Design a protein around this ligand. Structure first.
Ligand SMILES: Nc1nc2c(ncn2[C@@H]2O[C@H](COP(=O)(O)OP(=O)(O)OP(=O)(O)O)[C@@H](O)[C@H]2O)c(=O)[nH]1
Ligand SMILES: [Mg+2]
Lengths: 137, 1019, 171
């Protein structure tokens, strides 16, 4: 689910665990107190699910958790009481994923009520799964 | 009697008729359809001496065919007869006679839909256009039989176009038939095969006729444009119909349309057609034609010539529609542009031939995004481009990490920073200044605010890409490294930098809202590196607040500067907690303005409403700062309470809203005084309680309450509510618990007796506002996390005696939902200690006694009672099930309320039975009793469902589906037993749903249900 | 004394009868009574240029109770299409009612009205409306319960039918 990686090797685009939450790093800064003193990296990131801004300042050679972000495609077959019942290409149905909010969920309930074929790209990081992107042919 | 019919028909359309319009209308509905109504209509149309309005009513009287198989044939003959009659009088010289022409088209379209349905007989029409063609060739009644179903070729169809009105009638006929098929498809979906009939015959004739209008010059008529859009709408709603060559010839026609040749009239109509396709169903156009659209829009070039024609002639509305069409076209290629830009997974490799094409592609898009001619007032390209760049930002954020280009972050930073440099002067307040100067207080101001809100969300999506140093630090260092006002009192004196700093303050605010300034040390590092940042922020507030409003433009801009400044100060409350010494200059600057808008009484004359808006925005920021900086604002507590004692006086120049938020601000500071123990903090709480309750009792017993005293008492009651909410411990010990449980200062006793003194007056108890705020204060301590030492936490007997006290003397219509909602809070709080006998006591006193008189005939009180029972089922079903009125009152009453005529009442009753059936919190004994009771009233229940489902119409079918799904899933065996009895009462075809619905089980009903409603509706 | 003919159309349950009753008697009807046929009522507005009498024809949105259904549109001088923002079906049928009006009349001023804006859960966003791009078409968010934008539709119709955009109802 998560793997350790040195804070100095953290990318400005990759993902990292901050305050037990997966977050996509939006900017990476490094600072030093003294020339003989050790440095420290200051990371700022957007929460990959809630969208909140989380940041952490930690010294170098320190290990940070990096989550395994997966983007999967499921055809939307039902919307039951705010829960997206999707269909995998292998024939399995997942109704545990809730319907997203905002214009994303509004466009999902709109296109699903119209009857069009809807594919949903869902992002699973650590223990949370939520619909992200939509595709129609 | 026909002369009498024409008399009241002409009387119906007269400007000021005699006797009555409603009665002659009802009498007109009485003449039809009866055995002479059909014949009356034919005589109204065959007579040439009748007026056009009388003949239109004849076509309307013909339209009533819903009242067996032979009368349809006898009608369609006379439809086509009166058709050919008026359609021959048109093309020579009649004018303004095409109104009845269109109505007869609508009637024939309904005939085409009804006859071509599955069910001596009649064979399908298949093609009304051809039948209309040969009817213009004049042993007599025998012609219509063979002309109907089989007709001539296309060469003779072109021969019909010898005149112009002939082509107009054919174009209008195809349009009306399509538009009616669209209305019939949108109304109810029982078609499924008529589209195939249109696809096999009518589609060919319309495409050959439309393409003939596009290719041939003499046959070309501008009416085909309105006909193409109609066909495109019908195709976009149903489904392969090509339309590819139509788009090709429309592109050739649009490109040929210039100022000298056509005057850009056809180009405008074709752009409206393309704008409809791109905005609704862009996939209807193939990739090749979209490539031609790209080369025409983006290219001297033809698009540049048309844009210069609109700009030089000052045609801003048509230029706005042009921007909408181009943006909607580019929005469908968002994923392709984002991929070919920032990722390496595309068609071509090792070029890079597409990059220099796409680097110029984005460069031209940025030139169009900038686009001279200031926004809203003139152009909308930048306004609509906001949604395009927003989709590109979300697409870039959604790209995979391993698929990004090496220069992806650099190219994204460069492009999106140029967007910031473009849109910052775009949302500049100088644009709104010119809008209010030129157009005044028009809708362009509202569209400019929507433009600023759209760019605000654009920046919120761009921050995840540019980051803090490339987006946030650019704004902070831009206004933090230079002083906006060198002279004291912070007067900018300069308009350009004032607009620039207000734009930067608005964008910085919307970006910082998405942050958390407490957990972040970065905000302290960037602000400490800017000496004049906070000085310039207060400079914006003081410059706008102290700006004298001479005209209406300076007045509205004054409200805008204060709004942006006060909002940013409220957002910086987290940074003020990290940097307390910078908080002092803000509080003084706010209270100085708060006094500036208080001690002055010059009101000529609507300046007080702008004064009140400023006073509201100031006290809102003070409430926001006190909400986060409760601890840092402790030294100001002794000053604020003193200031409160002067504001709470009945004689003052402050508004009632600022009084409430001030008490909320003082309560925010008192809430953080839990250090020295409950005794020192209760000194402030008792002082505020005695001040609020003392002023209430002072106002009630001296100056007999008028409308002014009602607003003052309501203000102080809301102040007690704000004090109760502000004293709630934030979600972000036993000494306070034992103290407030005993409350030696009698805080709850003084507040409760104060609310009682207000609600004991007849002028207040029957007012909904005082009952609403009364139930809010009493229910403040309810549903709070246990263990929190809340001061105003009331037990069950106190809230019970409160509702029982004021419910009989109040107005039951408007004040009951507040008492019931207060009861729902008490039920959820004391769910552990509640007793079914106590639930019956609340149900009888508050609801049952007032039911048969005030509730049963009131929809609001009805949904109120249903929502109350649903809350009990959600919290503790054992209270409602073990009720004495469960089987005697609750079940029979809610059974009758199933086929209600109100939508919200339907959803309320449907949710009740759905929760009653699908409840998972039932005990094993409770589940057996529920299944027993549902089986007892199941027959009556399913009858009420189908009764409501039959008598209802669209948009309320789904609310029944969720109900029917649960009843079939939980009781599948008795479902058939209850359907075979309820269906024939509410014909034989209904049995079809039984097999098809129970087979599904759940999750795809409704689709089976409306195919039953569609059947059982026509009959 | 100048009068104009107003035709009020829309799907059933959009608050058409409640809207005209709120402007006539000032009362809000809570119960839903489906209008049978048409109901024509006068509404007087005293503006700076005198009195204006709008003959408002509240039509029936239901296919069953429609009555003449389009005979009410004859000699119509202005029209108001009303939909429900809480019901998407009511908004998708706006082009249907607009088409039946453009079939009878040609360029009469038509006002679009999304009712029940006071509802917290709104299923029709204000940004989705693109029908206000026409000179004779204008949209207004109205609420018959809270009187939000109460006299706005009648004011726009008065400005189009007269030609004085500075005229307002201040009576
Ligand atoms: N909350 C809320 N409810 C409203 C509002 N306006 C109307 N309603 C409700 O909507 C229901 C619709 O009533 P009608 O006016 O008869 O509906 P209609 O549009 O006239 O449709 P027909 O009667 O079939 O012609 C009424 O019972 C009102 O209670 C509103 O502004 N807010
Ligand atoms: Mg009505």
């Amino acid at each position: 689910a998560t793997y350790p990686m040195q804070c100095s090797a953290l990318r400005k685009n990759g993902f990292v665990v901050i305050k037990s939450r997966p977050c996509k790093i939006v900017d990476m800064s490094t600072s030093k107190t003294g020339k003989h003193g050790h440095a420290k990296v200051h990371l700022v990131a957007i929460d990959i699910f809630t969208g909140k801004k989380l940041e952490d300042l930690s010294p170098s050679t320190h290990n940070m958790e990096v989550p395994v972000v997966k983007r999967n495609e499921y055809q939307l077959l039902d919307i039951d009481d705010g829960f997206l019942s999707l269909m995998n290409m292998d024939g399995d149905t997942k109704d545990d994923v809730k319907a997203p909010e905002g214009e994303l969920g509004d466009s999902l309930q709109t296109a699903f009520d119209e009857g069009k074929d809807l594919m949903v790209t869902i992002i699973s990081a650590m223990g949370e799964e939520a619909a992200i992107s939509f595709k129609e042919a | 009697s026909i002369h009498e019919v024409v008399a009241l028909i002409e009387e119906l359309y007269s400007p000021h008729p005699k006797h009555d319009v409603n009665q002659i209308q009802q009498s007109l509905q009485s003449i039809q359809k009866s055995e002479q109504g059909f014949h009356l209509a034919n005589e109204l149309l065959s007579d040439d001496k009748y007026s056009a309005n009388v003949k239109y009513f004849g076509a309307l009287t013909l339209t009533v065919q819903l009242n067996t198989l032979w009368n349809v044939f006898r009608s369609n003959l006379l439809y086509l007869t009166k058709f050919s009659t008026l359609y021959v009088s048109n093309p020579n010289m009649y004018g303004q006679s095409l109104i009845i022409i269109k109505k007869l088209m609508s009637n024939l379209s309904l005939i085409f839909t009804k006859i071509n349905d599955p069910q001596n007989m009649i064979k399908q029409w298949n093609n009304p256009i051809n039948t209309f063609i040969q009817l213009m060739s004049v042993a007599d009644q025998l012609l219509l039989d063979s002309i109907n179903c089989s007709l001539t070729y296309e060469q003779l169809s072109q021969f019909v176009s010898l005149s112009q009105k002939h082509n107009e009638l054919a174009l209008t006929f195809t349009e009306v038939i399509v538009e009616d098929l669209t209305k019939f498809q949108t109304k109810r979906h029982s078609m499924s095969q008529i589209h195939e009939v249109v696809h096999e015959h009518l589609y060919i004739s319309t495409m050959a006729l439309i393409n003939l209008n596009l290719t041939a010059q003499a046959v070309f008529n501008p009416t085909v444009f309105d006909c193409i859009t109609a066909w495109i709408n019908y195709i976009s709603l149903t489904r392969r119909m090509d339309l590819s060559e139509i788009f090709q010839n429309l592109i050739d026609l649009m490109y040929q349309s210039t100022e000298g040749s056509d005057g850009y009239e056809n180009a405008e109509k074709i752009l409206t057609i393309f704008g409809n396709v791109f905005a609704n169903d862009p996939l209807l156009m193939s990739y090749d034609l979209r490539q031609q659209i790209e080369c025409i829009f983006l290219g001297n070039s033809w698009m540049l010539q048309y844009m210069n024609y609109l700009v030089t002639n000052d045609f801003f509305s048509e230029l706005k529609e042009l921007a909408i069409c181009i943006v909607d076209f580019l929005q469908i290629n968002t994923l392709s542009v984002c991929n070919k830009l920032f990722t390496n997974i595309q068609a071509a490799d090792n070029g890079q031939v597409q990059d220099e094409y796409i680097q110029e592609y984005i460069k031209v898009l940025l030139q169009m995004t900038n686009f001279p001619l200031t926004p809203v007032l003139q152009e909308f390209f930048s306004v609509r481009m906001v949604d395009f760049w927003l989709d590109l930002s979300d697409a870039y954020t959604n790209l995979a990490s391993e698929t990004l280009r090496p220069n992806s972050i650099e190219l994204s930073t460069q492009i999106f920073q140029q967007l910031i440099n473009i849109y910052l002067p775009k949302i500049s307040l100088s644009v709104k200044q010119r809008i209010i100067e030129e157009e005044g207080e028009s809708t362009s101001v509202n569209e400019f605010e929507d433009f600023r809100n759209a760019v605000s969300d654009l920046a919120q999506s761009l921050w995840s890409i540019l980051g803090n140093d490339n987006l946030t630090n650019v704004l902070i260092d831009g206004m933090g490294q230079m002083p906006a006002a060198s002279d004291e009192t912070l007067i900018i004196k300069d308009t350009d930098v004032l607009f620039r700093i207000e734009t930067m303050c608005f964008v910085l605010n919307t970006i910082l809202v998405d942050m958390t300034l407490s957990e972040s040390p970065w905000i302290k590092n960037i602000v400490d590196a800017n000496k004049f940042f906070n000085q310039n922020v207060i400079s914006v507030f003081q410059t706008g607040f102290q700006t004298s409003a001479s005209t209406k433009v300076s007045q509205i801009l004054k409200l805008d500067f204060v709004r942006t400044s006060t909002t940013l100060i409220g957002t910086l409350a987290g940074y003020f907690k990290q940097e307390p010494f910078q908080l002092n200059p803000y509080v003084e600057a706010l209270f100085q303005g708060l006094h500036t808008c208080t001690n002055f009484t010059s009101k000529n004359e609507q300046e007080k409403i702008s004064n009140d808006k400023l006073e509201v925005m100031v006290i809102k920021t003070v409430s926001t700062l006190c909400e986060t900086c409760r601890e840092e604002l402790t030294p100001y507590l002794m000053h604020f309470i003193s200031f409160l004692n002067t504001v709470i006086m009945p004689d003052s120049n402050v508004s009632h809203f600022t009084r409430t938020k001030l008490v909320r601000s003082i309560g925010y500071v008192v809430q953080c005084q839990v250090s020295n123990g409950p005794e020192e903090q209760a000194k402030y709480i008792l002082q505020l309680t005695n001040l609020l309750s003392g002023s209430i009792e002072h106002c009630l017993a001296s100056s007999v309450q008028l409308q002014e005293q009602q607003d003052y008492i309501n203000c102080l009651l809301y102040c007690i509510s704000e004090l109760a909410t502000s004293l709630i411990q934030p979600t972000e010990l036993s000494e306070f618990q034992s103290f407030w449980s005993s409350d030696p200062l009698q805080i709850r006793s003084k507040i409760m007796c104060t609310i009682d003194k207000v609600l004991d007056n007849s002028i207040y108890c029957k007012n909904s506002a005082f009952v609403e705020i009364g139930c809010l204060i009493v229910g403040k301590g309810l549903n709070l996390p246990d263990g929190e030492p809340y001061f105003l936490k009331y037990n069950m007997s106190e809230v019970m005696n409160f509702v029982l006290r004021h419910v009989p003397n109040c107005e039951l219509a408007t004040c009951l939902p507040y008492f019931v909602y207060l009861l729902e809070k008490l039920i959820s709080e004391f769910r552990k200690e509640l007793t079914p006998q106590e639930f019956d006591f609340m149900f009888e006193k508050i609801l049952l006694v007032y039911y048969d008189a005030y509730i049963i005939n009131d929809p609001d009180l009805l949904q109120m009672t249903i929502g109350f029972v649903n809350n009990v089922l959600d919290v503790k079903p054992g209270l409602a099930i073990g009720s004495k009125h469960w089987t005697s009152f609750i079940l029979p009453q809610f059974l009758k309320l199933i086929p209600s005529r109100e939508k919200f009442t339907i959803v309320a009753v449907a949710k009740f039975w759905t929760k009653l059936i699908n409840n998972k919190k039932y005990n094993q004994e409770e589940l057996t009793t529920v299944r027993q009771q549902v089986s007892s009233i199941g027959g009556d229940l399913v009858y009420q469902i189908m009764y409501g489902l039959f008598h209802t119409q669209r948009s309320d079918l789904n609310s029944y589906t969720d109900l029917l799904r649960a009843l079939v899933a939980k009781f599948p065996i008795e479902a058939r037993e209850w359907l075979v009895a309820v269906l024939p009462q509410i014909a034989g075809h209904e049995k079809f749903i039984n097999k098809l619905l129970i087979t599904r089980g759940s999750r795809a009903a409704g689709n089976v249900i409306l195919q039953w409603w569609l059947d059982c509706t026509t009959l | 004394q100048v009068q104009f003919k107003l035709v009020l159309v829309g799907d059933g349950g959009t608050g058409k009868t409640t809207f005209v009753k709120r402007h006539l008697t000032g009362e809000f009807e809570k119960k839903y009574v489906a209008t049978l046929g048409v109901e024509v009522h006068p509404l007087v507005f005293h503006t700076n240029r005198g009195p204006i009498k709008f003959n408002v024809w509240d039509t029936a949105g239901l296919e069953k109770f429609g009555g003449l259904r389009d005979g009410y549109y004859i000699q119509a001088q202005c029209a108001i299409i009303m939909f429900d923002v809480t019901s998407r079906v009511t908004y998708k049928n706006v082009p249907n009612w607009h088409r039946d009006l453009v079939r009878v009349c040609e360029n009469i001023p038509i006002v679009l009205c999304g009712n029940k804006v006071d509802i917290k859960d709104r299923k029709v966003k204000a940004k989705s409306i693109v029908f206000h791009r026409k000179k004779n078409l204008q949209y207004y968010d109205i609420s018959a319960k809270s009187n939000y934008n109460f006299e706005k539709p009648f004011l726009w119709l008065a400005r189009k039918l007269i030609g004085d955009p500075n005229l307002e109802f201040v009576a």
